[PDB]
Design a protein around this ligand. Sequence first.
Ligand code: HEM
Ligand code: HEM
Ligand SMILES: Cc1cncn1-c1nccc(CCNCCCc2cccc(F)c2)n1
Ligand SMILES: Cc1cncn1-c1nccc(CCNCCCc2cccc(F)c2)n1
Ligand SMILES: C[C@H](O)[C@H](O)[C@H]1CNc2nc(N)[nH]c(=O)c2N1
Ligand SMILES: C[C@H](O)[C@H](O)[C@H]1CNc2nc(N)[nH]c(=O)c2N1
Ligand SMILES: [Zn+2]
Lengths: 411, 407
Amino acid sequence: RFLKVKNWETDVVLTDTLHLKSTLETGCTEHICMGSIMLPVRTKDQLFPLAKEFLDQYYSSIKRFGSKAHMDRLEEVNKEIESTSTYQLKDTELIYGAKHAWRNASRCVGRIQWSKLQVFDARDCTTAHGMFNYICNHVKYATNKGNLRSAITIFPQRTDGKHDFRVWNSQLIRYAGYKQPDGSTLGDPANVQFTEICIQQGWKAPRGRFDVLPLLLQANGNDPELFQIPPELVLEVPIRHPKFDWFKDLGLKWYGLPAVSNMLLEIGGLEFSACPFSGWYMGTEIGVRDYCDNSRYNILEEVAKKMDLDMRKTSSLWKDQALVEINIAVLYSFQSDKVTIVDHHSATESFIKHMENEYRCRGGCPADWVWIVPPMSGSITPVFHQEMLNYRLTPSFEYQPDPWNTHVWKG
Amino acid sequence: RFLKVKNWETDVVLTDTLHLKSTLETGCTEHICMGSIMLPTKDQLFPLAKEFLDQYYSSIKRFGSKAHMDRLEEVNKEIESTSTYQLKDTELIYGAKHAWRNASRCVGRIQWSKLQVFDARDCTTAHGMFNYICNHVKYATNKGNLRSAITIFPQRTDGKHDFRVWNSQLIRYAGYKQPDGSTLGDPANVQFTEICIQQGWKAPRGRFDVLPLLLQANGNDPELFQIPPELVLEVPIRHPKFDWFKDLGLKWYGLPAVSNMLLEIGGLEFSACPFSGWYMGTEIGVRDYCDNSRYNILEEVAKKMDLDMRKTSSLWKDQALVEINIAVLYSFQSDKVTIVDHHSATESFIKHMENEYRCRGGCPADWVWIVPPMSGSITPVFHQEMLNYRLTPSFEYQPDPWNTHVW
Ligand code: HEM
Ligand code: HEM
Ligand SMILES: Cc1cncn1-c1nccc(CCNCCCc2cccc(F)c2)n1
Ligand SMILES: Cc1cncn1-c1nccc(CCNCCCc2cccc(F)c2)n1
Ligand SMILES: C[C@H](O)[C@H](O)[C@H]1CNc2nc(N)[nH]c(=O)c2N1
Ligand SMILES: C[C@H](O)[C@H](O)[C@H]1CNc2nc(N)[nH]c(=O)c2N1
Ligand SMILES: [Zn+2]
């Protein structure tokens, strides 16, 4: 069965067959759509079929379906599974796996880059300290003095789920958030819970508005340990506006390397619970969400004051107006310091291209519209007008519970 | 099967049970979500009537009463007899108010129970339809103190006697294809502007020509009627900051009025049921003025602002888009014509959700449509999970009349 999606600004219709290779569930039924819901230790029993399915995909992509290399590998994985209850991926399989998890990330507007991903193989890692080293090399490589390169570092897979490798931070680089006794919050409010933990764990906190959190790494199911990323490795960018000179005086800065570290990488049934990955920022992530969400740095107020906007009525659109200026400053500042960044127009336009290309060559591109459309100026980006189908392919990046909620403390 | 929705900005959680009544289907499956797709007999009729009447009599605290039982029997008999049935006035108003209450794409449902309903099932001609519409337009406009309204024409019979308003909105601007390869006026309306001319309209071929009405009664060939100008309140668009703004020659009409939908109540189908409310500011400034497939004036406005349109990076489109929307809100308020901004509206809707979850057990909402086409994340609906599902009574889409009309 074929399914068509239309672009209502260009009248271009595309056909999806890829959705037929979808197994995992969406959360939706024939009677209910849960497309705006953010969130709607494995036996040998179900492992081999997952293994086989992945391996068939792999060998097709290399144009070796049915080959002797193909079947022998299937036989090998099979026997290793029954003997050992699990199996190990070839380097080639891991690389392919990682690329594809990205490529199936329906919520990621940046997937056009998916083939150029540097994959670091950290499957030989055994300690927290070993983890820190691997992570440091990731950051240094990825940052490349401001000319950012995509990368993922992949730690050992889950075995029995009692020996999980985890990176406790949600992102590698991120600012502390401190709740004050008067109820107010210093620094990033998203990070308050995690900051408190770090402190509890032994972190001495500078207690400022932009303190780079420490790494809290957990290896082989052991209690997590703290590490301070060498400051010289953490590229930061002071935020200024090109016309407004009082903007620098807001004392705002942001870090250059966005890197998500709390997801789970599933490949061929194997679960990699520590798989931090990094790309580069689309401006709105910082300019709209990081700075302007009410539950974050919330600088709309203070920016609009300095702009002398009529804040007396929301129908003056002072909020919308300050939002744009803040986003202008973010992009200006990153381009000035030559730190890689992309604006929401450029990025959604490329996604549209990427998407068309994916229908032509792959037979579809799973995309989550609620997530793909940027959080400001929606309809003046081409994705707004683009119909999208959302479905789950493997390999895949999945959410996983916060480790402080699940961890078994040794002592 | 008792679902929960979360606001991720306030941590408020609501529990949804209303979904368990949902009858119609969504387009989605366990394997695929179609949330961003724009369009995913006596034995049929009576169960339909019963469900409606049951929920109606429950709404008036006479569930299982004699009056309830009486009516259920009365209608059952009329269906057996006439194959269709007719609604009591009370049921008709309840029905229409609730189709609005159930419209998962409408950010403005907080006002749902204050809907003026004009019963027009006694109508028989297009001239007659014109008179009903004119009255609706005058009442709703109310010299700019806009009031919500719907006018309902006879229900469908055998599908050959369908009443229809061919216009997509009662009041809209013509669109003309130029020899220039370009498009003067409203591109959304180019084809309709044709058909008007084909049926005989004499187009002044301006940019903002109010389209004529093209009304269809009892399945007859449709007729043209020009709305009295004195009933079409318009707003000249000026900016409270840029004096050059007026020179762009822009204006917009004050009464938004969807006329091409099908209203379904207790199994009956009203193919002609124009309704109107008031504009959320972005509807005009973002979509109407700035969609590429519409008036597409962003280029002209940024030029007039002398912004560096050289690179997307400057966010000149974003900068202009704001100012334009500041202007639209400014113009309407300066003329005492009701309009609401996206912050006030989305905020209102959040309140409406809280009431509905409280008093009804839920409220079906379509996130992809509720979040405004600008400044998405600085409005509260953005951070609000919504469950989407189809309750009845309902407004459904229907084919454009030209494609169907037996001539
Ligand atoms: C290189 C430039 C990239 C850009 C511009 C980009 C852009 C984005 C953006 C804007 C989001 C929205 C996330 C949010 O607002 O919470 C997102 C989500 C996502 N991206 Fe990317 N991305 C890039 C690279 C990557 C890479 C290298 C990977 C993996 C290897 C990836 C995988 C994902 C995944 C799994 C999500 C969903 C995250 C979630 O659901 O919380 N992206 N992407
Ligand atoms: C009174 C203030 C109202 C406001 C502020 C409002 C706002 C909106 C908005 C912004 C949309 C999305 C429109 C689009 O982008 O196409 C919408 C859709 C809709 N509205 Fe309302 N509306 C109002 C009144 C009404 C009334 C009186 C009714 C019916 C009696 C109604 C029923 C609907 C329906 C059925 C849709 C879906 C449109 C579609 O699917 O094409 N609304 N509304
Ligand atoms: C490094 C990267 C590559 N692609 C995107 N990113 C990126 N960088 C920096 C930050 C983020 C944010 C990722 N998403 C964070 C949202 C996490 C949540 C929180 C509550 C409910 C949910 F379903 C999900 N993504
Ligand atoms: C009067 C009113 C009350 N509530 C909203 N409106 C209102 N006024 C003026 C305009 C509109 C827009 C109606 N919806 C427009 C979408 C029509 C389409 C066109 C192509 C494909 C689709 F799926 C759907 N709504
Ligand atoms: C592609 C997407 O489904 C389509 O463009 C939708 C998106 N959201 C919308 N939201 C509103 N309010 N009105 C619209 O016309 C649309 N269009
Ligand atoms: C409830 C709602 O779906 C939720 O807030 C989503 C909306 N879309 C989003 N889109 C992106 N890119 N990132 C987000 O965190 C969200 N949040
Ligand atoms: Zn869905």
